[PDB]
Amino acid sequence: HHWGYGKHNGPEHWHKDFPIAKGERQSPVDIDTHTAKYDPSLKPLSVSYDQATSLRILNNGHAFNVEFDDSQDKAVLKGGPLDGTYRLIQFHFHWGSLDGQGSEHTVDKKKYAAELHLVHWNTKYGDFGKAVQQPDGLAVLGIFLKVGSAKPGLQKVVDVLDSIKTKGKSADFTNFDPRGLLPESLDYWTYPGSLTTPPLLECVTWIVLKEPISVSSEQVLKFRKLNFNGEGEPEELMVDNWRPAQPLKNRQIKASFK
Numbered sequence: 001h002h003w004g005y006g007k008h009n010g011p012e013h014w015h016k017d018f019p020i021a022k023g024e025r026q027s028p029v030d031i032d033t034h035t036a037k038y039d040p041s042l043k044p045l046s047v048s049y050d051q052a053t054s055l056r057i058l059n060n061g062h063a064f065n066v067e068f069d070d071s072q073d074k075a076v077l078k079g080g081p082l083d084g085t086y087r088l089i090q091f092h093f094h095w096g097s098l099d100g101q102g103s104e105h106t107v108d109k110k111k112y113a114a115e116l117h118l119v120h121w122n123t124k125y126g127d128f129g130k131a132v133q134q135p136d137g138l139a140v141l142g143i144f145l146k147v148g149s150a151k152p153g154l155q156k157v158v159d160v161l162d163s164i165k166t167k168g169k170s171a172d173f174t175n176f177d178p179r180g181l182l183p184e185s186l187d188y189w190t191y192p193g194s195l196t197t198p199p200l201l202e203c204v205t206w207i208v209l210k211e212p213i214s215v216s217s218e219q220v221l222k223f224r225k226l227n228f229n230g231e232g233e234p235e236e237l238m239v240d241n242w243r244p245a246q247p248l249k250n251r252q253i254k255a256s257f258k
């Protein structure tokens, strides 16, 4: 009876195995754009993905991960609210059963169809496993997806999903360039938070871009054909793999713009 997003093991149940679910810096959160403070001390984000080395795509049972070689400083996030250098380890998405839901963060209560998370770990801690034990261990760059015109740079991901339909399937996925998933503007909101799945560790500096990317209906429909179940099990479409907004508590959301 493991956690998930089904009818009986969803987000409202997670606190029973992971009491930090009710902690002081849980994510995601609603971003109330009127209350977020413009912070002129925040720096432009530095996204350096020119040398990124994608390796493999994995259906992890809850979403799919596009994994990167993070055994040296290839693809790094720096600047913005961050001190030091954060190495890209993987990205994944959260998405809905319908276009009107799917995102984890919300903006003035608006849900987007999906949300991309580029996960990076702080090099000062040497490895991801050590970094998630630290209050500044991870930096997750979040990008909203809306449904409209296709995102050409997403199509390579869409096209391999039929090869990783069920939990635990993987496929080679080299030479994928994550720059093609970025919006034009790197204006962002930032706040201290958590992983949004168990173990829900409070180790994330969240950076959420204001500008969504547009994907096509057909692209997001192909996300919705993935399965939470393993091969040869009854089908559980992989949809609504998002955690709802959690209490902001004693936190300030800062804007880089405004």
Ligand SMILES: COC(=O)c1ccc(SC)c(S(N)(=O)=O)c1
Pocket: 060, 062, 065, 132, 195, 197, 198, 199, 201
């Ligand atoms: C400390 O947390 C993790 O490393 C972690 C948490 C959740 C997941 S899947 C929901 C994974 S994954 N994508 O299976 O490597 C990794």
Ligand SMILES: COC(=O)c1ccc(SC)c(S(N)(=O)=O)c1
Pocket: 060, 062, 063, 064, 092, 093, 094, 117, 119, 140, 194, 195, 196, 197, 241
């Ligand atoms: C469905 O969410 C996931 O599968 C998922 C897997 C890994 C991570 S971080 C290693 C996350 S998150 N949203 O970054 O905490 C989420």
Ligand SMILES: [Zn+2]
Pocket: 092, 093, 094, 117, 196
């Ligand atoms: Zn995520």
